[PDB]
Amino acid sequence: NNFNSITGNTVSLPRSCLSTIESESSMANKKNCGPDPYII
Amino acid sequence: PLRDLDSEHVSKIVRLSGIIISTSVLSSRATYLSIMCRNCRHTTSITINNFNSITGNTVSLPRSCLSTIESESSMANKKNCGPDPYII
Amino acid sequence: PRHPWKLSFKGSFGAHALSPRTLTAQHLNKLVSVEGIVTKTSLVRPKLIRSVHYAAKTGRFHYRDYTDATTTLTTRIPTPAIYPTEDTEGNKLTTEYGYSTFIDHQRITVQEMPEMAPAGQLPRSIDVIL
Amino acid sequence: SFDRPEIYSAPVLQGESPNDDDNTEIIKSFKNFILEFRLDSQFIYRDQ
Ligand SMILES: [Zn+2]
Numbered sequence: 001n002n003f004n005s006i007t008g009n010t011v012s013l014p015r016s017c018l019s020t021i022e023s024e025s026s027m028a029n030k031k032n033c034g035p036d037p038y039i040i
Numbered sequence: 041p042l043r044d045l046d047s048e049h050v051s052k053i054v055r056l057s058g059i060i061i062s063t064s065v066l067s068s069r070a071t072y073l074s075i076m077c078r079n080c081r082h083t084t085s086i087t088i089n090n091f092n093s094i095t096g097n098t099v100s101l102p103r104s105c106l107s108t109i110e111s112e113s114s115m116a117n118k119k120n121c122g123p124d125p126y127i128i
Numbered sequence: 129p130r131h132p133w134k135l136s137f138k139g140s141f142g143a144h145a146l147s148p149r150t151l152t153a154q155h156l157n158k159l160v161s162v163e164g165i166v167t168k169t170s171l172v173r174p175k176l177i178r179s180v181h182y183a184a185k186t187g188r189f190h191y192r193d194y195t196d197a198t199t200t201l202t203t204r205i206p207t208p209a210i211y212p213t214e215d216t217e218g219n220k221l222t223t224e225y226g227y228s229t230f231i232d233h234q235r236i237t238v239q240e241m242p243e244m245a246p247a248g249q250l251p252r253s254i255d256v257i258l
Numbered sequence: 259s260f261d262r263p264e265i266y267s268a269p270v271l272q273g274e275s276p277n278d279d280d281n282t283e284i285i286k287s288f289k290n291f292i293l294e295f296r297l298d299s300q301f302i303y304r305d306q
Contacts, residue, residue, distance in 0.1 A: 032123075034122040034123070035120075035122070039203065039205060039206065040203070074216065074217075076216075079207055079208065080208065080209070080210055081207075081209045081210065082210055083212075083214050083215075083216055083218075085218055107210050112213050112262045112263075113210060113211040113213055113260070113261075113262070114259070114260040115211050115259060115260075116210075116211075117194070117208060117210060117211060119208055176259060179259060211259065213261055213262045220261075220262070220264075221261065222261055223259050223260065223261055225259070228259065
């Protein structure tokens with residue numbers, strides 16, 4: 001909701017996958033997705 | 041004799057006698073392994089002829105994809121495959 | 129009596145009948161009909177779709193398919209597969225030009241028509257990939 | 259869409275004089291030991 005910034009990505013894609021820190025699923029099937037794994 | 045081994049014998053050939061208490065099960069070490077990049081799909085082969093090291097991977101999978109540094113293809117289609125991208 | 133069939137559209141578009149000035153970000157991911165003038169056209173360039181290679185040691189032909197984001201309407205996970213110069217066993221590959229497929233690609237610029245454009249303002253344009 | 263450039267070599271000149279600590283000379287001496295050693299009257303390592 002904020003577009004005030006210029007020459008800056010004040011909001012960007014997260015630097016690592018958010019599945020691990022959330023731990024949403026009980027199974028949770030060392031696995032690392034990598035830096036900047038998200039695709040728009 | 042086994043108790044007369046010294047630091048002067050380190051990394052040198054020694055002849056020594058004794059009795060054997062245990063023989064472990066056979067482990068499988070890789071001599072030739074063909075590896076492929078995870079997303080890049082670059083194909084590489086690693087040949088290992090040395091197996092003396094214990095408790096250590098003296099030869100391991102490369103930490104980054106080797107396609108970029110080689111630059112073997114003229115097209116070369118910033119793209120980074122990631123840390124440890126290779127799969128045996 | 130093999131290439132997949134494509135679709136073209138005609139008729140009234142309503143609110144989607146626009147001009148390069150009238151194109152806004154609310155029209156993104158929507159089918160739009162845009163009238164204007166062509167100002168710039170690029171060189172027609174072939175784009176490699178499938179590369180065919182020959183391994184002389186085994187005497188076999190291999191191939192690799194390439195896609196980009198402009199080919200599909202839906203986004204896909206970008207898997208950039210490099211141009212193969214080895215087979216899986218390490219034998220040298222030679223490119224088989226003429227067995228590979230290249231699809232023609234162009235980019236044009238469509239600016240709003242000088243009679244439908246305001247008389248003092250700088251014109252607005254948009255790139256179209258063909 | 260071109261292929262690899264290839265790198266290859268061929269021996270032409272004599273080069274520098276061989277050195278005993280060089281790996282190639284050690285390999286050659288080991289090869290000569292394998293081929294030419296005689297225990298009593300036989301090439302034991304070659305036959306082995
Ligand atoms: Zn790669």
